RNA sequence: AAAAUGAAGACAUUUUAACGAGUAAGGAAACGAAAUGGCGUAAGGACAACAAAAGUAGUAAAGAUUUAAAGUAAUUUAGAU
RNA sequence: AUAAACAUACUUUGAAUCGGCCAAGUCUGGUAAGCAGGACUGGCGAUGCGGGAUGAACCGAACGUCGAGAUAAAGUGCCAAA
RNA sequence: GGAAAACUUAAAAGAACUUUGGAAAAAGAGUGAAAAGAGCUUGAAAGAGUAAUAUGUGAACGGAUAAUUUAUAAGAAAAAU
C-alpha cells in the first residue's frame, strides 16, 4: 500500500504505515483527525490522556448514538469518546517514526503530524447465528495508517 | 450613486394600507424608509369593526403547536411591519433585503426627530376617504388588543410636541429679523446693480 | 479572410435524469416515456436537439482558425492538401511516434501549412532546456 | 512558372522532396498583410465628402458646455468646423476656462443661447496640419458682467433641473 | 466635481407575469413621472458604473461600467426602455443609474 | 415542389416559393439531381507513402483518468498523465 | 358564384385500433349524482405555450433556432409588466 | 443435486544487512528496464481517506440571463504624393 502524498523534503521526514492493522476504522479515523498538525510531543501527551480518559476524542462525522459529554465544549462537537485500541496503535506508530527520524538525524523537538490518514481495509467474515435458522455476517472493519512527520519552518 | 440618506414619512394621518403599497414598491427600488410615529395611522371601520377582524385574525394559529404557529403582533409599529411585508416578494433575497430597510416607531426617536419629514399624497387619509366614514387609529386599536405601551408613547409624544414648541417660537424670532435684514440689503444703493438682476427674473 | 462562425447554442445537450442517477450518462437519448416530463416538453424543462439548431452550410464544421481539419499519417500524406493550405489545416494522428511527427512538422513548414499538434509529444525540453 | 499557391521556402538542410527545389534558388519574400490604400490627402481648403452637417444652433461665436469627454462641464467659445474631420475647433479661453484649443465631435456638446460672436480671431493656422502637428503619438513597434465666472466654473446640474425642462 | 448625469432606478427586466426577458431593462429616471417627458431622453446613453473590490496582485479596475441606450418609453408613467452591451445583472435591481445629456440634439 | 446547370467541384450543386406540434404506427439497403439522412460494436474479403521497402507502433499500441475542439444529436478528434 | 396541377383518380402491400373521457342556448331513465345511456359538432386522449392563483378538457392560440415590432384571451394599488 | 477460482518478471535476480517493535511489521538499504513486492500485467464505477477550492435558515439537482474569479486564447506588419 502507497502513501496518500509525498514529503516536500525527503531529507527532513520520517514515515510509518500499517497494514491490515485490527482496530476499528470508524473509531481510528476520528482519532486520527485530533491528532493532524499538532508537535509529536503534545500528541503523544494527548494520546496518552484519551487512554486515561482525560482528554475527549470528537467523533465529529461518525456521531450515530454516540453519548456526549462534558469535554467536548469548545470543539463544536457535542459528542466524544475514548477509543482505547485505536490510540494505543496509533502510539505505537508514533513511536516507530520518531525512531525512524532520529536514524535520520532530525530533531524531535521540532517533529509534528503534518500527513496522516487512515483508509478502509478487506475485512474478516463471521457467523452470527439468527432466529428462524439464519446466519449472518459478523465482520471486522480493519483500516491501513500512514504516518508522515515534517519539521516546522517559517514561510 | 448611491442612496444614504433615509425618506422619514410621518404617519400621522395616513392610511395603513396605502402608505404600505406605496412604501413597499419604493423599497424595491432600493430607497431607505422610516415610518415614525406608525400608531397614527388610520384603518377603515369602527372599533366593535375592527376588533371583530382582530378576533378573527387571532383564529388562525398551528393546533398541533401555537408556538409554531402564526404569530400576531399587536404593537402598532408591528402592524405596518405585518402590511409592508405582505406587499413585498417571498422567499428571496429580493425581498428579505427590501425589508431590511424598513421601520417603524410609535413615536419619533431621537436620531428621527430632527429629520425633513415627508407624506405620501395617495394614502391622506383626506382624500381617499369619505368623510363621514368611521376610522381607528392603529394606537387605540392596538390598546383594546393589549398593546401595554400606548400610554408611555402618549407622554414622550407630548414632551416632543412641547421641546418643538420653544425651538419654534425662537426659529421664528430670528428668520423674521433675518427677512427685515434682507429687506435693508434689498433697498440699498450699493447693492443696486444686483438687485435689478433678481428683480428682472422676479426673485426680488 | 475569415467569416463569422455563429452558433446557435453553445452548451451541451445533457440526457434526461442524468444529473441524479450516475447509471444514467449524459449522451442524449430521446425520452419516450409516455408521461415524460422533457418530451412532452413542459417550461423549464423543453430542450432536446432538433435540426434548426444547425449552424450556418458555409462554416459548418470549422475551426476556431478558420481552417478545415485534416488527418495525416506520415509526411506523403501533406501532399494532398498541400495546394489547399488557405483551406485545410493538418492534423497529425494520436498514435504517430516522436520520430515521424519531426518529419511530419518539419516538411509543413517547408508547404507552408498550419499543424495544430506542434506541440505534441515534445522531449523533456521544458525546463532547464 | 510556380502556381499561385506554391510559395517556396527554404529548408534547413532537411530532408526534401526531388520536386521541391534547393533554397539556392528559392528566394523569400516578405511578408505581406496590407490591402486597402489610406486617404487621400485633398487641398487644405477643400472639405472632405465625409462632412457631418452642424446644427443650426452651432455658430460660430458661440458658448458651449461639453457634456462629455476630458473637459466634461467646462465652457468653450465656438471658432469654426474642421473640414476634414467635421469636429469642432473649440476654445475654452485657457486664460479662464483652462480648456486649450481643441476639436471636440459635435454630439457632446451644449450650444448655449449666449453668444460672445468676435470676429477677427486670425485662424490662419488651426487645422488639420496644426492639430495632427500638435498631437502626441505612441512610439510604435519596430522603433459682459459675470460673463467670466460663467466661463470660469463648472456646469452642474442642480437640484430641482431636469433636463427635459432646461433650456440654454 | 459636477453632476452631469440624472440617477436612474434600475427596476427590473422588461417582463410578463411568469416570463422575463432580460435584454430590455426598465429605468425610472429622477424627474419624468409621464410618457410625454420621455421624448427628450429617447437614445441618450446610460452606464452602469458598479465597483469591484480587486486585489492589488490584479491590474483589473476597481471601477466599471456598462454603457446602453435609452431606447423606448414604456407604459404612462415615465419608465422607460435601455439595451446594454452586456444585460445588466439581477444583483444589481434597485441600484442607481446614470442617465447622460449626451449624445445631444440641442 | 419547380426551374437552371451537371463527369466530379462539394457543403448531398444553384435560385425561388411554401412549409416544420404529435402517443400507437410507418418510412430495409442501392438508385446525380439520388423512392428519408446518419453514429457506434465485433468479425471476413479488399484498399491505405505509387519512383523497387508503400497505413500506425518501444522516439511508446490497446486500455484507463481528465482538458479542449468539431457535430443539432447519436458520437468523433486532439493534448496531458 | 367561389375554390382546385406538389389538382385529381387511384392500385398493391401492410402497421396500430375498436376499455374511452369532457363541453353544451341537446335528449331519455332516475329525487339526484363528478350517475347510466344516446343525436350533431369541437376537443382531451396524442398537446406543449399566454390567461383563469392552482386544474386533461375552460378562453386565446397550436410549437424548427433566434432578433425586432404590432397583437389575442385578459389585465393596469403592492406581490406583478401595465 | 452440483459450483467458484486464468495472468509478477526476460530471468526469482522473490529484498536479507542495520535501527525501532513482544512479534507481525515499519524506515533505511539493495535487485530489477520498470516494484510490477507475491492479495504481484492494466486497474474503471459504486464506497471511503487526504490535500486544494467554494457555499449555506425545513430537501437537493437542472435551464435562460448577466456579474466576480480562474483558465483558454487573436499581431508584425506599416500612409499620401
Not at chain 1, 432466529?131 to 483500516?143: D, E, K, L, M, T
Not at chain 3, 442524468?18 to 444514467?24: C, D, E, K, M, T
Not at chain 4, 495632427?132 to 460673463?147: D, M, R, W
Request: hydrophobic share 40%; net charge positive; proline share 4%.
Amino acid at each position: 500500500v502507497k502513501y496518500c502524498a509525498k514529503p516536500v523534503n525527503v531529507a527532513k521526514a520520517a514515515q510509518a504505515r500499517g497494514d491490515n492493522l485490527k482496530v476499528h476504522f470508524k473509531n481510528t479515523y476520528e482519532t486520527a483527525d485530533a491528532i493532524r498538525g499538532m508537535k509529536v510531543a503534545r500528541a503523544q501527551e494527548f494520546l496518552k490522556n484519551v487512554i486515561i480518559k482525560k482528554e475527549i476524542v470528537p467523533f465529529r462525522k461518525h456521531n450515530g448514538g454516540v453519548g456526549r459529554k462534558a469535554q467536548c465544549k469548545g470543539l463544536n462537537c457535542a459528542f466524544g469518546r475514548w477509543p482505547v485500541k485505536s490510540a494505543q496503535f496509533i502510539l505505537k506508530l508514533l513511536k516507530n517514526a520518531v525512531d525512524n527520524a532520529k536514524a535520520k538525524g532530525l530533531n524531535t523537538a521540532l517533529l509534528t503530524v503534518s500527513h496522516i490518514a487512515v483508509q478502509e481495509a478487506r475485512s474478516s467474515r463471521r457467523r452470527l447465528y439468527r432466529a428462524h435458522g439464519s446466519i449472518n455476517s459478523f465482520s471486522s472493519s480493519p483500516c491501513h495508517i500512514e504516518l508522515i512527520l515534517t519539521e516546522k519552518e517559517k514561510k | 450613486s448611491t442612496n444614504n440618506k433615509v425618506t422619514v414619512i410621518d404617519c400621522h394621518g395616513h392610511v395603513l394600507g396605502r402608505v404600505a403599497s406605496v412604501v413597499a414598491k419604493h423599497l424595491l427600488l432600493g430607497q431607505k424608509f422610516v415610518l415614525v410615529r406608525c400608531e397614527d395611522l388610520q384603518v377603515c371601520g369602527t372599533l366593535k369593526m375592527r376588533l371583530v377582524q382582530w378576533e378573527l385574525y387571532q383564529r388562525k394559529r398551528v393546533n398541533t403547536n401555537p408556538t409554531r404557529g402564526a404569530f400576531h403582533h399587536r404593537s402598532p409599529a408591528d402592524m405596518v411591519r405585518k402590511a409592508v411585508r405582505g406587499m413585498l416578494p417571498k422567499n428571496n433575497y429580493r425581498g428579505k433585503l427590501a425589508l431590511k430597510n424598513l421601520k417603524c416607531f410609535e413615536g419619533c426617536p431621537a436620531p428621527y426627530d430632527k429629520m425633513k419629514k415627508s407624506s405620501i399624497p395617495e394614502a391622506a387619509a383626506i382624500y381617499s376617504f369619505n368623510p363621514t366614514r368611521k376610522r381607528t387609529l392603529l394606537g387605540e386599536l392596538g390598546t383594546a388588543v393589549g398593546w401595554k405601551y400606548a400610554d408611555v408613547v402618549a407622554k414622550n409624544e407630548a414632551e416632543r410636541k412641547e421641546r418643538a414648541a420653544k425651538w419654534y417660537a425662537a426659529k421664528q424670532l430670528k428668520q423674521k429679523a433675518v427677512a427685515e435684514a434682507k429687506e435693508k440689503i434689498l433697498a440699498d444703493e450699493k447693492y443696486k446693480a444686483k438687485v435689478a438682476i433678481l428683480k428682472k427674473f422676479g426673485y426680488a | 479572410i475569415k467569416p463569422k462562425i455563429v452558433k446557435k447554442y453553445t452548451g451541451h445537450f445533457k440526457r434526461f435524469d442524468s444529473n441524479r442517477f450516475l447509471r444514467v450518462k449524459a449522451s442524449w437519448r430521446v425520452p419516450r416515456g409516455i408521461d415524460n416530463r422533457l418530451r412532452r416538453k413542459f417550461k423549464g424543462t423543453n430542450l432536446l436537439p432538433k435540426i434548426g439548431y444547425g449552424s450556418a452550410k458555409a462554416t459548418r464544421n470549422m475551426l476556431p482558425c478558420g481552417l478545415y481539419k485534416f488527418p495525416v499519417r506520415n509526411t506523403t500524406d501533406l501532399e494532398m492538401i498541400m495546394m489547399q493550405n488557405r483551406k485545410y489545416a493538418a492534423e497529425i494522428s494520436h498514435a504517430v511516434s516522436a520520430k515521424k511527427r519531426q518529419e511530419i512538422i518539419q516538411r509543413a513548414k517547408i508547404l507552408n501549412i498550419r499543424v495544430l499538434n506542434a506541440d505534441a509529444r515534445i522531449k523533456k525540453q521544458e525546463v532547464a532546456q | 512558372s510556380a502556381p499561385q499557391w506554391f510559395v517556396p521556402v527554404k529548408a534547413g538542410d532537411a530532408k526534401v522532396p526531388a520536386y521541391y527545389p534547393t533554397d539556392d534558388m528559392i528566394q523569400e519574400q516578405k511578408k505581406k498583410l496590407r490591402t486597402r490604400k489610406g486617404a487621400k490627402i485633398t487641398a487644405l481648403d477643400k472639405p472632405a465628402w465625409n462632412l457631418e452637417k452642424l446644427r443650426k444652433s452651432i455658430v460660430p461665436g458661440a458658448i458651449l458646455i461639453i457634456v462629455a469627454g476630458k473637459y466634461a462641464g467646462k465652457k468653450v467659445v465656438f471658432l469654426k468646423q474642421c473640414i476634414k474631420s467635421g469636429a469642432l475647433i473649440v476654445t475654452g479661453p485657457f486664460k479662464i476656462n483652462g480648456v486649450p484649443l481643441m476639436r471636440i465631435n459635435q454630439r457632446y456638446v451644449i450650444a448655449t443661447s449666449q453668444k460672445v460672436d468676435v470676429s477677427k480671431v486670425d485662424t490662419t493656422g488651426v487645422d488639420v496640419k496644426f492639430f495632427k502637428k500638435i498631437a502626441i503619438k505612441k512610439a510604435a513597434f519596430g522603433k459682459v458682467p459675470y460673463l467670466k465666472e460663467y466661463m470660469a466654473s463648472y456646469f452642474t446640474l442642480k437640484n430641482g433641473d431636469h433636463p427635459h425642462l432646461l433650456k440654454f | 466635481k459636477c453632476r452631469l448625469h440624472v440617477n436612474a432606478v434600475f427596476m427590473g427586466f422588461q417582463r410578463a407575469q411568469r416570463n422575463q426577458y432580460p435584454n430590455v431593462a426598465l429605468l425610472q429616471i429622477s424627474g419624468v413621472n409621464t410618457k410625454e417627458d420621455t421624448p427628450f431622453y429617447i437614445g441618450k446613453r446610460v452606464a452602469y458604473v458598479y465597483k469591484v473590490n480587486v486585489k492589488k496582485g490584479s491590474n483589473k479596475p476597481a471601477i466599471r461600467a456598462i454603457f446602453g441606450k435609452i431606447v423606448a418609453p414604456h407604459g404612462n408613467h415615465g419608465v422607460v426602455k435601455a439595451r446594454f452591451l452586456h444585460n445588466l445583472p439581477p444583483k444589481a435591481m434597485g441600484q442607481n443609474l446614470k442617465v447622460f445629456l449626451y449624445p445631444s440634439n440641442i
